[PDB]
Design an enzyme around this catalytic site. Sequence first.
Site, PDB file in Angstrom:
ATOM      1  N   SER A   9     -13.160  16.987 -20.042  1.00  0.00           N
ATOM      2  CA  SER A   9     -11.956  16.736 -19.261  1.00  0.00           C
ATOM      3  C   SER A   9     -10.762  16.958 -20.183  1.00  0.00           C
ATOM      4  O   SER A   9     -10.621  16.261 -21.185  1.00  0.00           O
ATOM      5  CB  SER A   9     -11.948  15.304 -18.727  1.00  0.00           C
ATOM      6  OG  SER A   9     -10.725  15.007 -18.075  1.00  0.00           O
ATOM      7  N   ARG A  10      -9.921  17.935 -19.852  1.00  0.00           N
ATOM      8  CA  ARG A  10      -8.703  18.212 -20.625  1.00  0.00           C
ATOM      9  C   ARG A  10      -7.695  17.059 -20.565  1.00  0.00           C
ATOM     10  O   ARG A  10      -6.948  16.845 -21.518  1.00  0.00           O
ATOM     11  CB  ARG A  10      -8.037  19.513 -20.154  1.00  0.00           C
ATOM     12  CG  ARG A  10      -8.686  20.788 -20.676  1.00  0.00           C
ATOM     13  CD  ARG A  10      -8.249  22.007 -19.864  1.00  0.00           C
ATOM     14  NE  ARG A  10      -8.315  23.262 -20.621  1.00  0.00           N
ATOM     15  CZ  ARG A  10      -7.336  23.773 -21.377  1.00  0.00           C
ATOM     16  NH1 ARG A  10      -6.166  23.151 -21.524  1.00  0.00           N
ATOM     17  NH2 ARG A  10      -7.534  24.931 -22.004  1.00  0.00           N
ATOM     18  N   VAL A  11      -7.678  16.319 -19.455  1.00  0.00           N
ATOM     19  CA  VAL A  11      -6.779  15.170 -19.299  1.00  0.00           C
ATOM     20  C   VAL A  11      -7.234  14.003 -20.185  1.00  0.00           C
ATOM     21  O   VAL A  11      -6.403  13.324 -20.784  1.00  0.00           O
ATOM     22  CB  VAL A  11      -6.655  14.727 -17.820  1.00  0.00           C
ATOM     23  CG1 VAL A  11      -5.782  13.482 -17.685  1.00  0.00           C
ATOM     24  CG2 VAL A  11      -6.085  15.866 -16.981  1.00  0.00           C
TER      25      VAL A  11
END
Lengths: 488, 456
Positions: free
Chosen positions: A350-352
């Site tokens: 997950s980039r977030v």
Amino acid sequence: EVAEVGQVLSVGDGIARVYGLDKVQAGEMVEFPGGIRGMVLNLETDNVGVVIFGDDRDIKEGDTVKRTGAIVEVPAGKELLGRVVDALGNPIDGKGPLNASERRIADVKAPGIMPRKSVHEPMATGLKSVDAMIPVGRGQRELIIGDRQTGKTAIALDTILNQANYNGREADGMKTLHCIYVAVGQKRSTVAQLVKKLEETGAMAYTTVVAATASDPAPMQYLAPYSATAMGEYFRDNGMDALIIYDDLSKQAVAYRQMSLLLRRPPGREAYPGDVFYLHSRLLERSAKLNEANGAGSLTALPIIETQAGDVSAYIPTNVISITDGQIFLETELFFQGIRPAVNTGLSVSRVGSAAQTKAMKSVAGPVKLELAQYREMAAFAQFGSDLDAATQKLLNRGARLTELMKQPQYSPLTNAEIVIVIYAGTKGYLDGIPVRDVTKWEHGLLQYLRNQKADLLEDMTKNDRKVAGELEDAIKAALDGYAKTYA
Amino acid sequence: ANGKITQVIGAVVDVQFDGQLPAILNALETENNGKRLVLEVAQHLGENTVRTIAMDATEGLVRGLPVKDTGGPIMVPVGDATLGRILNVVGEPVDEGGPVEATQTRAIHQQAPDFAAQATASEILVTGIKVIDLLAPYSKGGKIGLFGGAGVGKTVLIMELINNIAKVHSGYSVFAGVGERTREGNDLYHEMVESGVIKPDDLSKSQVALVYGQMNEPPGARMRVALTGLTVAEQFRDATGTDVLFFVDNIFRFTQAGSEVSALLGRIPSPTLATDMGAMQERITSTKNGSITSIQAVYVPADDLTTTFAHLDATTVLSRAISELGIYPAVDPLDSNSRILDPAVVGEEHYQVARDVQGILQKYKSLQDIIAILGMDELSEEDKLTVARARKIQRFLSQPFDVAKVFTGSDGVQVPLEDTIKSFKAVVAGEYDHLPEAAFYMVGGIEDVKAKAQRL
């Protein structure tokens, strides 16, 4: 006549060449004789290429094609909640008219740079693997990718079912997550079974199903993701939160490829149209988190892609990986072995990240993905049967138990508070004296103990979100100590 | 004079003319339901009909609509009015900040600078960043590649490069965002506001102009938006004679968009995919009247996990390992390299000091496993000394950035090229073995190390 009306020259395979229609605009909806709808995609010198949304066997060469004077639009609003509709928003559940009070263009430009805000709020799937290791936030796009029968649809459905635990609480600082499931190219029976689960659990109350099944014509499969996104954008634009699931975008791309080649458009890479990336990128760009000035609403997307033999380097998979904010790769080898959800810890991300988690979750979940990726690497090395020192054995013993803790059956999501304690228990050595066989048993008893004997701790973690340290850590340690005495 | 629309096939739009036939690359204009739509001429088809690519959506276009030939290519606003703004491919503002009141406009397609007025011999571009200038120096008119994942200070580096070229060279910068995520485009803008490279309240004093054509936009827009950015950069070079930076995030998307457009016009499909620029390459060069240096954020679809030259003159490799030792910027001093790191370009002293520094860090890396497992006493006296200088040098390659000041509180610094060469030369020779290691951490040149040493 000729300007506002046309004549069918040829027809077949969901496509029609139409003479006339001189003043028809590109992308405009058109009416065929028996109430059958269609969209104009090709404006040519001597004809108009139309993609047909209804049944094409009825239409015959000579028929009258009529302008609607409008670009393809669909109904939207809370009236669509509880309902199952097709790609144009016509209900298909036999529950009478929709009676919508709003209409939106299906394929539209995504919001620009300024109205957005950074994704900072949890979109909880209820699964330990995803919520701890690959956390999804509100406004994020998170790809779910893998072969057939790797559990992709089940993860998405569990996410919808999980929202009931947090929904209808427009009071305690909790916006309702409205769900939009898009079936693209699935069997009619498979959709019916999914809807049946949504209704019997009560999750249908806050869900809209949009179905373009394998039996429905290709233009409906192409359109359904866009139309459903427009339905989701009702919530996003009016200060509300929504979730949309494209199940799946591999079949939308296949549908798009068929329509395009039948319109005599040139082939691109793997015979898909030249802008097949743009198909998915303009769709997924519409999922977003808006700022306070624009109502603070959000649309989160879980697009699904079907790989073949784990080939994530393939063209359409590569496109959607380059669009979304990370992916959850579900693997066949893990699924085959009963490691479900079958999350490949090395390839999933997950980039977030931490921004999509609670303070409690963030404080314990940090090192878990790396440890499990390293564990699987070490277990693979252990197969060779060379010497394993005590330190290596200690990691193998720990990681084998963490693997068991990440196992989770269908329809059994856990709350944020519950996952935090389970993660704490695994990472802090509470399962070290428990056989690998009995970890899921040990977890099942813990959850029942926590729900019955320490509901006050679970409600306290939920409403008063803090990091697991000091007093909260003592409550969690005590809870686990208390449970350890019952199990003995 | 005018023409009319005969066909519309997605982004592909055919326009039949009466009078003069528009030349290839000319911008045409037409009204799609009130709003203007720019079209770019690709082919001549015969029967007095041209074949164009749209720069926006074509839904709502009707056959017969009038089309104006503008006479030249796509024109965009240039000069100081672009500073602190975000423009799209056709020069319209997409930052909701009102009109771009510019005096001049310039064509996005432009012929390359000829052999006359090209600056003879390769030449260093001083960034003021010690590790870059010493070990992997950038060249004027060069193709630079920034390599790095998330959480290694890549955006912070880009913004300091923007900052330093404004401060030390009185130059300008342009950032071209090409086919990337709008979510991340928003974040980049607000990060630039935080550190003062964009100043909302005094926009002309901003150090960078933004040009955005992200994933949401059609193939034609994403194909040309980089050239729009380059044309803004070219104006800053010509007008002031200074050294300009052209940031491109990223070339893979530029090529991807161009590939989409080729396929749509009916072309059959079949390492350098990430770094190879088009004819755009010829416009990136160093002249007598300033220079444009390309700083590209190197990307492929490698969003699963976090290599050599191809079309690059230097590389800046950001490293997670280096970041976790507390070394900012997180540049790998051995994996970063430059074509102009060569005595014929940078001089004999520059080259030798850089080579010695590399040799010391390499040897230190070879003795790393021995130091971790056994003590420092395990090493011979000769190797013990080089480790002490290596550990000083590692810290001395780190540097505080003006852009970071808003987060940390500490002032940034730009170190002159000679200060960098002399300071590291002295350390290599062992003039400052007596000073503590902490003195070399997070400072400018050797005079800052002395000042920090006296404080401790």
